[PDB]
């Protein structure tokens, strides 16, 4: 079942990196299936990752490369991985006055309080890394944040 030669070569690359950091032994820890997957270029939700093998703690289970490959492709069988349209219509729900600005206390409330909660630390980071600022009280541009988060740490 299908991943191309190059697809595999790619999964391998990332795969090795991970087994490297936990002891080059041909195995990666289920805990790391989420991260690994993120490094291939995907964006899975925790439910997605658990329904596909990810364990929470660290001694539990391990995966060879040939076991992760099919995870990668089942995982890749989904398609509401999420678009802009999907992220825009949802931010608007909060845009009180209709410009595209949203208090940050609020975006953060969303991100930390709702959905698969996000850490305090994680919020500060994504916010420092994207170059998203609040002004006097013209809170935060939610699209700015969307475009950048969806653009990757390494833009160019």
């Amino acid at each position: 079942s299908q991943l191309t030669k190059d697809e595999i070569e790619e999964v391998r690359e990332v795969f090795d990196l991970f087994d490297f950091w936990d002891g080059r032994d041909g195995d990666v820890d289920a805990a790391k299936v989420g991260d690994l997957l993120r490094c291939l270029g995907m964006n899975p939700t925790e439910a997605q990752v658990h329904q596909h093998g990810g364990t929470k703690k660290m001694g539990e289970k391990a995966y060879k490369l040939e076991e992760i490959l099919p995870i990668y492709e089942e995982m890749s069988s989904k398609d509401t991985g999420t678009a802009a349209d999907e992220f825009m219509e949802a931010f608007k729900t909060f845009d009180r006055e209709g410009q595209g600005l949203i208090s940050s206390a609020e975006i953060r409330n969303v991100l930390k309080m709702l959905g698969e909660r996000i850490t305090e630390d994680q919020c500060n980071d994504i916010f420092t890394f994207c170059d998203i600022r609040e002004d006097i009280d013209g809170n935060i541009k939610y699209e700015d944040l969307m475009k950048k988060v969806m653009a990757g740490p390494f833009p160019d």
Partner: protein, 145 residues
Amino acid sequence: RVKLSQRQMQELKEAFTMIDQDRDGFIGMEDLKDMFSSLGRVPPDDELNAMLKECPGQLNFTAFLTLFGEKVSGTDPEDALRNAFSMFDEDGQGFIPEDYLKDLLENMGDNFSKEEIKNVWKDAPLKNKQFNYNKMVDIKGKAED
């Protein structure tokens, strides 16, 4: 491998040339005994000869570079090693936090043996439960002190 490069291959030139006073280019038993003398240490025959067995027979220098075919494997460079250690030092020199380096060589990456771990603490530049890297990078090659 060939990575027994020039800096590596000329530094080896002056080396073999000193042990010299020579037999038209032959690190000799004598060229040797004459050296370990100015080195100041202790010359045992059987042994001194044991150093020979390593090369099939007759050490010019062509064989001298070949003999050093255990050196070239790793032999990563001077600096390269410093930067390497650097990475795992966030608090500018005084260097890396012991624990870290243990969880680092012992159970992350190409794991070290609990046996390889000690082979390292014995010497190890250390204090304040914190490690010294420009000191270890040093030992590697060997400035000394």
